[PDB]
């Protein structure tokens, strides 16, 4: 084509609508009963989805309330750019294909956005992954003390129940829920806060003050299937357990998310790194 | 008449004013002491008022804070249209004259708005029914151990005590109050929250996580005269009892409401389906 | 069934989701290219859709930004209930089946909500009609000198472009658009304001001060195909033409809407009352 | 009675409701066609109503959007208390029975609230005066280039058309409207701003900068029947005419309002000070 | 003077400023140590101030956060006008000179504003009373478990500590504080809520549901010196004690306030009705 | 004193109140008619007040709407600290006693806050200077063709005319007004916007795009008595004249202010640097 | 230079940017591990930083969330100017060079702004002091049982986690943190509220009611290293200890701050007035 004399092939508006609709319809029908739902597309949730979907047989829905995925991983600290990842999580960066400046006990990715865009590109390309962005998980499906999926709505509806006539949610059944809701914002820690309000867990003390050396090891260690059918990963772990926060460093999110992914595979009865069967 | 050359008969502005004033103020005088007040015109409250007002002896005031009645029954889930009603509540739809597409354990009304408009149209035509919309129930009338009506105001006043000099409420005495306030919004669960703040009940746990099979049977079961003079119906039942929620399905709202209406007839000493005397 | 011992047939959450999704997305595909789109489900828009859809050949989509349809027709004036309809528009009420208390030059419907629910119930039951509520028309489709449909989005999105990353709209092609957006609210007069901002008309003076005798005859008279492909009806007519307003009387809305429907049938080449071929 | 052992006579809640309702109903029926409506109960509007209602045969409705009447006359300047009134308007204070500290060219009432409460008490006691507080004039009634009354609503509705489904206004016919809307607030200058938007006057330049000596004489001089059926008085005069403001002094408001009252009597064909017939 | 040819005597702007300033200064100096401060100028606070200041030797400061005094006594219920006062409180109306329509167990003042304006006019005329409107009591002065006055600020500052750099309060010492803060609004029940937060009282259950017959007698009975140096009166009594509310009736406010006034006189060691020494 | 065993001398709350009241109200009386009022205590206004008040004959009131004085001079750009001052304005820094790091065509003050605090400390110590902070100039006093002072109120009142009953302003007469209101914020360019709305100047184009080399020389040049009685200085000059802006450099503000001060001395008939008589 | 013909030396925009960037980022690197961080630049925090930085060996970072430093020390009470300082804290004023009007048990600084500007000017000139304004301390660094610095962000970010994708904080390590966050505003008492939410202290009762004689001595007394690594000073002490407040008097803030500074020097192992080694 010539950028100086450019013509698009013709279109009809109604075709564009119908293509989008049909495709979103079929996705919602498929994923109404899914193997894994990941709630939250921050560094931890992306890392978990990336790890799980390496198994091509596993269906992965990602529910993200924001229009943009990525969570807090578009920046470092104080609106600066550099992303510090402590060793040995730089091996995870190697696998995804993200360059870094190597230091002695850590590496520096030149922009957090480079990690986030790269992992998302590789993740979203896979046929077994679907991103439902601009959609919130408002609640859980819980039957006989097992989490069995999530209660969904458009994110803007979920934040506007006070300004309109009622707007019921939808429902997505899942074998395993990976809750990766962070701590930040009006949606922070949605999943663990709901476990508490329905009496399935007893306390959500909230994250403690900052201590990077304690926090990152603790967050990985504490990542687990918290109740039957629900794994918690990322900063949401610190909320439920009262672990210290780590601030502007990203290794624990990546590793927590990877561990959560392997826990989800285990929960599905599939080869996994938790068992040593992978 | 001719749509091409159309003339309305003459009017005067004063006539319009006086018509609306004389009629509304007459209705307020009529209903200031009444048989039943239904608080909330959602699916459960409309169903309750519909059921009660089948008896002509019985005067029924419906108090609805929104300008529009209907509550959460203008939509299905995720801003979609279809209204799922589990059997055998399709027999209630048959009685009201709402068509549906039948499936094995449920039916589908093509638009929630078709239910709501249809039942409202039949209900409002009745001479013993009065809709006071744009009016909130701010509080209860309680004398000794018994609910004896509601404390009312324009909904916008009830929402703007923070912005103007004080604006006292009005009062409506009733033999029975049917509280159908839902759980959603700033007015969610007004009646049961008030029973708790005045010490007449102990807790309002809030609805639990979603489980349609448990929730709908539970809401019907738990629909009751909670304290002397006050029946609670619809999702407000889940709030008081800590029942699971059901999300985008509507049978329990209709049946809970119908049961609440029958309980109100029984409380008034009238033939009813609770006793088997209807 | 027994209200004392009540059991719903079994369900699964996934069934409810898939039912609502399959049906809504099927409707969107059906109506993405359609015969008539009515924007606004107030008294004028409901009247127009009611009139058009008397012809079964004609597919009619109603776009309503609010969750609740009905517009300003849930109340009379000053939050009072009575709906004044000047003669001879009481003949339209007769046709729809809405009772009234007759006076000399007008009739009184006991509650505006009785009109609105009744006409909606009859309208929505029809197979050729689809209500897309909680959906705003953000813009028009205009090709050359002609309106060819509407640009749509969830209403909450259309109201929240200031708070999230961009969220493109959808598109619905139509042979005729009937714009019935009122004057009230942030969406008041959307269609005529847009004709002005794209240069297809010159001014939108806004409604003038109140004069019922002038206003209602004027609104009917001025109801028209304003530009090729687009009819304007109801109070949106006053905005474009600088007509006086009428306040709490509703005959002109019903008759303007009826005339707009007949004008749409005429524009589609069908038997109609404008020509005298119905 | 004994303040140490006090018992009220018994009451029924429904009686209180019915008394308020019946009385407000009859007032609204009476005043739906009134001789004078005064819009705004600030110092100018109170002064105008006080002057007019000295004729016991003249019906006076006062429409005030705030719950509290009094407008800007509860304080002096900068939240201080003293009310400066230039001579010879202290003669007006003498008539109403408001004490002052007399200085050479002006007097000082010790609290603006003393003037406001005193004039209101004397005004409201009269049988031909009715105060409709918490009610806004949203618009005018205009028929054939004469103002014929006002379009009313509850004030909170008039400020909330953007948050609810539409809420039509009511209407009050009047022989003469006295617009006394001030300049301050979101309702400031309602009446003259509407004259401009409907093309009945051509410009509303807004008040000029402060100059007490020019402003107070000018405001009195310019008080007039601005268009047929509508007198403007008080600070709203400065808005329409572009007169200077006067800030924390009150004589012109009192005298403007008195003049407006005498102009209203003249407009009604009654003895008055404008003609020298009183 | 001639309303047709009117001239004010000359003024200088700076004189107006200086008069207001000097006068407000001297008032604030005088009242920085006062005999009684009444917090809240609603029906109860006005009634208390009116009762106390019948003793010309007693200094009374009234602190009212709103620009307009009067509290909730500008209206009846539901924005209607009539003020119901149960017998025998109509004797209080007789004393103040407020007309009413006499019924069997109650009387009806035609507009609540007639009571409020009349009592305020008589109250404010007295030399020993000062109204500090647009000023909030933010806190109490408490020394050795006795209330010794109030912590004040301009009301707008008291509501804007979140939008500006810090703005310290002022202080007013008092022999007795009469707290009459109502229950309504963001300032509702200021005085009793502060007693609770500083541990001087133990519970503030809040007002119970409506029951006029119980409430009005209870409110009068419970009006008292709650802690040394502080009397509570009006609806604030119901907040501290958990008494029922009474809604749109005004006798208890008047009588509570009168009793509070006589309690204040007693606390000052002066002749009073509590002792039978008056 | 001993920080380990520290006792303050005794106080009484009333003393503190009376001290603050007597002093402030005395200052208001002093300055109600004054020589110069400076509106705005940003870098330009502080510089102007500093320059003028070098003459002891001259009384200078500074009106600043914010609680904190200093305007935009607490920071450099992008929330960084360093304050760039182009030569030869470093000579003004020398005079005030502000250190800097010298470069070739400019100097760097280490923190903008060091300039602002330093100049304020020297300015405020002077007996002829009074800072009225938390006070806005809402309007001008204009008599005939000449500015003669300012219309003042508490800043929060000036921002809350939409939320309360009216609150009149106060007035300060001045021989000269120096308007230094900046361009930023809701109060940006108050003085020049007012000249335009009262018709004394024709346009306020607003500042143009950034060009430091053009802008700083232009702002100094254009600093002038714009209309009789009123000098405009600082970025408010760019707004009136359509000059380019300079962004994060401060020399023009200091020099414009100094020139404005010299112009004020000249206007007062005093020795000045404009004429060469200083 | 000539104010009549004024030319600035040339500049380039890039130079200004690079100057501000290089300097700020150099300061951030310097202070990322530092001796003392003072959180809050109100009267107590400025006094503490002033006291500490008398020792040149000691690096002191001041973190202030507002753009303007100074806290509540720009005004006295009720937006009045005079700053009351009880003796013997006037000796601290003597040392800083702030003039006052002496009384018997206290002195009066003519404007609070004179104190604040003066102390800031002396403080900020010192080479060992850095003001990071527009920067909030969001959290603490806590390792084991000890506070080791602060978690920082731009203040606007710290206030806008609800409106944007996540924005991680930054970190500053410190040997000692002096928390001087006041009680006022959304950031009031940040440090002590955090000690409570992480479980390091048990309660934050909040300040009690006003009692100047008790409060000021108590605040000095209670100023302490509350937990290892963290001193609390100023009104934040009242919040943690439930001390009474003092309102518009400032001696305790200055003395508490001075004591806090001496406690910080002692904690650093340096000569100090707590020990008597200074
Ligand atoms: Zn109330
Ligand atoms: Zn819901
Ligand atoms: Zn777009
Ligand atoms: Zn309207
Ligand atoms: Zn004003
Ligand atoms: Zn700027
Ligand atoms: Zn975070
Ligand atoms: Zn404070």
Measured CA to CA, the distance from residue F214 to residue G11 in angstroms comes to 10
How far apart are the CA of E104 and the nearest CA of chain B, in angstroms?
19
Q: Do G170 and A80 touch (CB under 8 A)?
A: yes
Could you identify the residue written with the tokens 């470069």? F103
Q: Which CATH class is domain D12-32?
A: special
Residue A160 CB-density burial (10 A; 0-12 exposed, 13-18 middle, 19+ buried): middle
Domain boundaries, chain F: 12-32, 33-268
Q: Do F151 and D80 touch (CB under 8 A)?
A: no
Q: Do B78 and A162 touch (CB under 8 A)?
A: no
Query: Residue E221 in contact with residue E269, Cβ under 8 Å?
Result: no
Listed residue (G278, G277, G201, G198) closest to G236, CA to CA: G201
Taking residue E226's Cβ as centre, other Cβ atoms within 10 Å add up to: 22
Listed residue (E228, F131, E256) closest to D8, CA to CA: E256
Q: Tell me the β-bridge partners of F131.
A: F62
Q: Tell me the β-bridge partners of D36.
A: D60, D176
E137 known ligand binder: yes
Q: Tell me the β-bridge partners of A60.
A: A36, A129
Measured CA to CA, the distance from residue C226 to residue C238 in angstroms comes to 13
Angle of CA points E177, E178, E183, to nearest 5°: 125
Q: Tell me the β-bridge partners of D227.
A: D230
- Give contacts of B24 with chain E, Cβ < 8 Å: none
In the DSSP assignment, the letter for residue B67 is S
Angle of CA points G246, E227, E27, to nearest 5°: 55
Listed residue (A132, A159, A139, A156) closest to A25, CA to CA: A132
Measured CA to CA, the distance from residue A131 to residue A108 in angstroms comes to 28
Tell whether the torsion through CA atoms of E211, E217, E220 and E223 is positive or negative: negative
Measured CA to CA, the distance from residue A192 to residue A197 in angstroms comes to 9
Measured CA to CA, the distance from residue G152 to residue G63 in angstroms comes to 8
The contacts of residue A115 (CB under 8 Å, 6+ apart) are A43, A73, A83, A93, A96, A98, A109, A250
Measured CA to CA, the distance from residue A165 to residue B75 in angstroms comes to 9
Helix or strand (DSSP H, E) at B47: helix B43-53
Query: Residue B263 in contact with residue B223, Cβ under 8 Å?
Result: yes
Measured CA to CA, the distance from residue A77 to residue G199 in angstroms comes to 26
Best B150, B161, B168 residue to mutate vs chain E (most E CBs within 10 Å): B168
Measured CA to CA, the distance from residue F120 to residue F135 in angstroms comes to 17
In the DSSP assignment, the letter for residue F241 is H
Angle of CA points A140, A146, A150, to nearest 5°: 20
Q: Do E154 and G210 touch (CB under 8 A)?
A: no
Measured CA to CA, the distance from residue E11 to residue D106 in angstroms comes to 8
Q: Tell me the β-bridge partners of B171.
A: B151
Selecting from E19, E125, E216 the residue whose C-beta is nearest the C-beta of D114 gives E125
F178 at interface of D, judged by CB pairs closer than 8 A: no
Measured CA to CA, the distance from residue D172 to residue B167 in angstroms comes to 23
Query: Residue G51 in contact with residue E147, Cβ under 8 Å?
Result: no
Could you identify the residue written with the tokens 């030319």? G7
How far apart are the CA of A154 and the nearest CA of chain B, in angstroms?
6
A142 at interface of B, judged by CB pairs closer than 8 A: yes
Taking residue E144's Cβ as centre, other Cβ atoms within 10 Å add up to: 8
Listed residue (E47, E89, E35, E61) closest to E265, CA to CA: E35
Residues C138-168 as b or e (16 or more Cβ within 10 Å = b) = bbbbbeeeebbbbbbbbbbbbbbeeeeeeee
Pairing of strands D146-154, D170-179: antiparallel
DSSP chain A: --TTS--PPP--HHHHHHHHHHHHHHHHHHHTEEEEEEE--SHHHHHHHHHHTTSTTS-EEEEESSSS--TTTT--BTT---EEEETTTHHHHHHHT---EE-SSEEEES-HHHHHHHHHHHHHTSTTEEEEETEEEEEEEEETTEEEEEEEEEHHHHT-TTTSS--B-EEEEEEEEEE---SSSTTTTHHHHHHHHTTSSS-----EEE-HHHHHHHHHHH-EEEETTEEE-THHHHHHHTPEE--S--HHHHHHHHHHHHHHHHHTT---TTTT--
How far apart are the CA of B147 and the nearest CA of chain A, in angstroms?
28
Pairing of strands A208-210, A224-227: unpaired
The CA G247 to ligand 8 mean position distance, Å, reads 6
Torsion of CA C210, C211, C217, C219, to 10 degrees: -10
Which tokens in the block code for residue C200? Answer: 């297809």
Domain C33-268, CATH number (from 3.50.50.60, 1.10.490.10, 3.40.640.10, 3.40.50.2300): 3.50.50.60
Taking residue D96's Cβ as centre, other Cβ atoms within 10 Å add up to: 16
Could you identify the residue written with the tokens 């602190």? E63
Listed residue (C29, F92, E67, A39) closest to D79, CA to CA: E67
Helix or strand (DSSP H, E) at D102: strand D101-102
Taking residue E177's Cβ as centre, other Cβ atoms within 10 Å add up to: 30
Chains C and F touch (3+ CB pairs under 8 A): no
Q: Do G141 and A245 touch (CB under 8 A)?
A: no
D29 at interface of C, judged by CB pairs closer than 8 A: no
Q: Tell me the β-bridge partners of B267.
A: none
The contacts of residue E130 (CB under 8 Å, 6+ apart) are E27, E30, E31, E59, E60, E61, E62
Kindly provide the resolution of this structure in angstroms, with one decimal.
1.6
The CA F26 to ligand 2 mean position distance, Å, reads 61
> What are the angstrom distances between the C-alpha of D11 and each of E84, E89, E99?
10, 13, 20
Tell whether the torsion through CA atoms of B209, B211, B214 and B220 is positive or negative: positive
Q: Which chains touch E (3 or more CB pairs under 8 A)?
A: B, D, F, G
Taking residue B83's Cβ as centre, other Cβ atoms within 10 Å add up to: 31
Q: Do F124 and G108 touch (CB under 8 A)?
A: no
Measured CA to CA, the distance from residue A203 to residue A168 in angstroms comes to 29
Helix (H, G, I), strand (E, B) or coil at F231: strand
Measured CA to CA, the distance from residue B73 to residue C68 in angstroms comes to 9
The contacts of residue F165 (CB under 8 Å, 6+ apart) are D66, D68, D70, D71, D72, D74, E66, E67, E68
Q: Which chains touch G (3 or more CB pairs under 8 A)?
A: A, E, F
Measured CA to CA, the distance from residue D195 to residue D189 in angstroms comes to 10
Cis peptide upstream of residue G88 (ω within 30 degrees of 0): yes
The CA A222 to ligand 7 mean position distance, Å, reads 18
The contacts of residue G224 (CB under 8 Å, 6+ apart) are G231, G232, G263
Helix (H, G, I), strand (E, B) or coil at B142: strand
The contacts of residue A102 (CB under 8 Å, 6+ apart) are A90
A65 known ligand binder: yes
Listed residue (C212, C196, C181, C172) closest to C37, CA to CA: C172
The CA F140 to ligand 5 mean position distance, Å, reads 13
- Residues belonging to the binding site of C for substrate are 44, 64-65, 72, 137, 168, 183, 235, 245-247
How far apart are the CA of B150 and the nearest CA of chain E, in angstroms?
8
Measured CA to CA, the distance from residue D216 to residue D88 in angstroms comes to 12
Measured CA to CA, the distance from residue A163 to residue C156 in angstroms comes to 10
Q: Please tell me which residue of chain C has the smallest CA distance to A66.
A: C164
Measured CA to CA, the distance from residue B66 to residue B69 in angstroms comes to 6
Selecting from E17, E149, E167 the residue whose C-beta is nearest the C-beta of F32 gives E17
Q: Do A248 and G143 touch (CB under 8 A)?
A: no
Query: Residue F135 in contact with residue F24, Cβ under 8 Å?
Result: no
Query: Residue G91 in contact with residue G64, Cβ under 8 Å?
Result: no
Measured CA to CA, the distance from residue G124 to residue G126 in angstroms comes to 5
Residue ranges with CB less than 5 Å from ion ligand 1: E 184
Residues C48-76 as b or e (16 or more Cβ within 10 Å = b) = bbbbbbebeebbbbbbbbbbbbbbbbbbb
Helix (H, G, I), strand (E, B) or coil at C109: strand
* Phi, then psi, of G12 in degrees rounded to 5: -130, 140
Listed residue (G232, G223, G164, G169) closest to G195, CA to CA: G232
């Amino acid at each position: 084509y010539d950028l100086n004399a450019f013509t698009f092939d013709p279109i009809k508006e109604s075709i564009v609508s119908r293509e989008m609709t049909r495709r979103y319809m079929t996705d919602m029908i498929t994923y109404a009963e899914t193997d894994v739902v990941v709630v939250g597309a921050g560094s931890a949730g992306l890392s978990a989805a990336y790890e799980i979907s390496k198994n091509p047989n596993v269906q992965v829905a990602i529910i993200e309330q924001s229009v943009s995925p990525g969570g807090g991983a578009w920046l470092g600290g104080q609106l600066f750019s550099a992303m510090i990842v402590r060793k040995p999580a730089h091996l995870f960066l190697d696998e995804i294909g993200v360059a870094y400046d190597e230091q002695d006990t850590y590496v520096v990715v030149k922009h957090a956005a480079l990690f986030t865009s790269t992992i998302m590109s590789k993740l979203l390309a896979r046929p077994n992954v679907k991103l439902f962005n601009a959609v919130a998980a408002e609640d859980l499906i819980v039957k006989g003390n097992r989490v069995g999926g999530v209660v969904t709505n458009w994110a803007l509806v979920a934040q506007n129940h006070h300004t309109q006539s009622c707007m019921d949610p939808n429902v997505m059944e899942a074998k395993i829920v990976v809750s990766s809701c962070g701590h930040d914002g009006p949606f922070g820690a949605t999943g663990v806060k709901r476990l508490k309000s329905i009496g399935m867990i007893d306390h959500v003390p909230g994250m403690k003050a900052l201590d990077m050396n304690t926090a990152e090891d603790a967050i990985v260690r504490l990542t687990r299937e918290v109740v039957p059918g629900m794994i918690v990963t990322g900063m949401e772990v610190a909320e439920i357990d009262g672990a210290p926060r780590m601030g502007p460093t990203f290794g624990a999110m990546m590793i927590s998310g990877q561990k959560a992914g392997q826990l989800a595979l285990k929960a599905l009865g599939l080869p996994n790194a938790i068992d040593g069967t992978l």
